[PDB]
Structure 1
């Protein structure tokens, strides 16, 4: 089997991407944030504290003839940005772009933190990291990909995120029309539960390539590109007036600037992030100070190849017995 679904930016900055997901019988369609950096599929629901729902579409398990309460199961998660959610668990039928999993753990939110409440466009998350990170207790649950894997034509899914435009998540096949040149595959460590890999270096603008190992994770659920402070400093030094602002919480730059590209290495291959991809607009409405799309990972404890990086590539998440990651230009 295969699946194919369009993923759409939630706003004009590509702060995140939502993908429609069918849950239950009859189908309840929710727009979820596909997140290769976590492993819980959770949703706003009829059980969510009413004051914490503000415009989201909710899953109502009582209206699904295939929903079953997973007795005794609870979940609770906290994300790298400080947000969190928690609740109980159903199993139900979940389909993505024509691909159907029966008995998928659907984690029903009883509580969500303010940032989820405040984002009306995201109805929940669909985790696509390794199932070892799933928070369900006392019986850990499998991700949608993990449940679908055996049925898929090929044990893979691909992320093709658009810049200021829709893109595609595919399951079970590689669309050879969706990228240019060849796909370069690179080793993955699953030891931390992430799609963790090692980039072979970087360049800033038309600058020479610096060969250097950068360990990080491919994380569709993180907006920006988080790299070591040395790297990030080298980038922003090429932008007149750019500075790190502790009050804003990162590198800012004059909105009048033309940003240079940023290249990262995948083996011997190179992915180029256009400078425009690195502009996240005024820090506040009307400001002429703009927020940078490349930020320091110092104090996160891990480098993160988030949407800024991944949207410049066609990315293969290969879930074979020994997982690997593939990157192609597009």
Structure 2
């Protein structure tokens, strides 16, 4: 089998991408944030505290003839930004772009933190990291991809995120029309449950390439590109007036600037992020200070190839017996 679904930016900055997901019978379509950096499929639901729902579409398991309570199962998750959610668990039929998993664990939120409430466009998350990170207790659950993998034509999914435009998540096949040149595959460590790999270095703008190993994760659920402070400083040093602001929480730059590109290495290949992809716009409405799309990972403990990096590429998440990641230009 295969599936293919369009993913759409939630706003003009590409802060996140939402993909329609069919849950239950008859289908209840919710727009979920596909997150290769986590492993829970959770949704706003008829069980979510009413004051914490503000415009999201909710999953109502009592209206699904295929929903079954996963008795005694609870979940609770906290994300890198400090947001969180928790609740109980149903199993139900879940379909993405024509690909159907029966008995998928659908984690129904009883509580969500303020940042989720405040984002009326995100109805929940669909985790695509390794199932070892799934938070369901006492019986850990598998991700949608893990459940679908054996049925797929090929045990892969691909992320083709758009820049200020929709893109595509495909399951079970590689669309050879969706990229230029070749896909360079690189080794993955699953030891932390992430799609963790080592970039071979970087370049800023038209500068020469600096060979240096950068261990990080391919994370569609993170907006920005988080890299070591040395690399990030070398980038922003090329932008007049750019500086790290403790009050804002990262590097800012004058909105009047044109930004240089940023290249990252995948083996001997190179992915070039155009400068415009690094511009996240005014820090507040009407400000002439703009937020940078490349930020330091120093406080995180891991480098994160988030959407800023991934949307410059066609990315293969290869879930073969030995997982690998593939990157192609597009």
TM bucket (normalised to shorter chain) is: over 0.9
- Per the TM alignment, residue 21 of structure 1 is displaced from its structure 2 partner at its CA by 0.1
Looking at structure 1, the residues matched to 3 and 46 of structure 2 have their Cα atoms a distance apart, in angstroms, of: 28
- Per the TM alignment, residue 201 of structure 1 is displaced from its structure 2 partner at its CA by 0.1
Looking at structure 1, the residues matched to 93 and 290 of structure 2 have their Cα atoms a distance apart, in angstroms, of: 43
1:36 aligns with 2:36: yes
Residue 183 of structure 2: aligned partner: 183
Looking at structure 1, the residues matched to 312 and 284 of structure 2 have their Cα atoms a distance apart, in angstroms, of: 26
In the TM superposition, what whole-angstrom CA distance separates every residue of 1:153-186 from its partner, at most 9, and x where no partner exists? 0000000000000000000000000000000000
CA RMSD of aligned residues (A): 0.2
In the TM superposition, what whole-angstrom CA distance separates every residue of 1:176-235 from its partner, at most 9, and x where no partner exists? 000000000000000000000000000000000000000000000000000000000000
Looking at structure 2, the residues matched to 247 and 79 of structure 1 have their Cα atoms a distance apart, in angstroms, of: 22
Tell me the SS of whatever aligns to 1:57: coil
Normalization by structure 2: what TM-score? 1.00
In the TM superposition, what whole-angstrom CA distance separates every residue of 1:284-307 from its partner, at most 9, and x where no partner exists? 000000000000000100000000
- Per the TM alignment, residue 9 of structure 1 is displaced from its structure 2 partner at its CA by 0.1
In the TM superposition, what whole-angstrom CA distance separates every residue of 1:46-98 from its partner, at most 9, and x where no partner exists? 00000000000000000000000000000000000100000000000000000
Looking at structure 2, the residues matched to 166 and 45 of structure 1 have their Cα atoms a distance apart, in angstroms, of: 26
Looking at structure 2, the residues matched to 5 and 284 of structure 1 have their Cα atoms a distance apart, in angstroms, of: 33
The number of residues matched between the two structures is 330
Looking at structure 1, the residues matched to 182 and 329 of structure 2 have their Cα atoms a distance apart, in angstroms, of: 8
Looking at structure 1, the residues matched to 288 and 176 of structure 2 have their Cα atoms a distance apart, in angstroms, of: 42
Looking at structure 1, the residues matched to 26 and 286 of structure 2 have their Cα atoms a distance apart, in angstroms, of: 45
Looking at structure 2, the residues matched to 173 and 286 of structure 1 have their Cα atoms a distance apart, in angstroms, of: 44
In the TM superposition, what whole-angstrom CA distance separates every residue of 1:128-157 from its partner, at most 9, and x where no partner exists? 000000000000000000000000000000
- Per the TM alignment, residue 114 of structure 1 is displaced from its structure 2 partner at its CA by 0.1
Looking at structure 1, the residues matched to 280 and 149 of structure 2 have their Cα atoms a distance apart, in angstroms, of: 36
Residue 329 of structure 2: aligned partner: 329
| Structure 2: segments with no counterpart, 5+ residues | none
Looking at structure 2, the residues matched to 208 and 181 of structure 1 have their Cα atoms a distance apart, in angstroms, of: 21
Tell me the SS of whatever aligns to 1:146: helix
Looking at structure 1, the residues matched to 281 and 258 of structure 2 have their Cα atoms a distance apart, in angstroms, of: 12
In the TM superposition, what whole-angstrom CA distance separates every residue of 1:5-30 from its partner, at most 9, and x where no partner exists? 00000000000000000000000000
- Per the TM alignment, residue 259 of structure 1 is displaced from its structure 2 partner at its CA by 0.1
Tell me the SS of whatever aligns to 2:263: strand
In the TM superposition, what whole-angstrom CA distance separates every residue of 1:249-280 from its partner, at most 9, and x where no partner exists? 00000000000000000000000000000000
1:226-305 equivalence runs, <5 A: 226-305=226-305
Residue 74 of structure 1: aligned partner: 74
Looking at structure 2, the residues matched to 101 and 313 of structure 1 have their Cα atoms a distance apart, in angstroms, of: 28
Tell me the SS of whatever aligns to 2:280: strand
Tell me the SS of whatever aligns to 1:309: helix
- Per the TM alignment, residue 241 of structure 1 is displaced from its structure 2 partner at its CA by 0.3
1:214 aligns with 2:228: no
Looking at structure 2, the residues matched to 244 and 127 of structure 1 have their Cα atoms a distance apart, in angstroms, of: 31
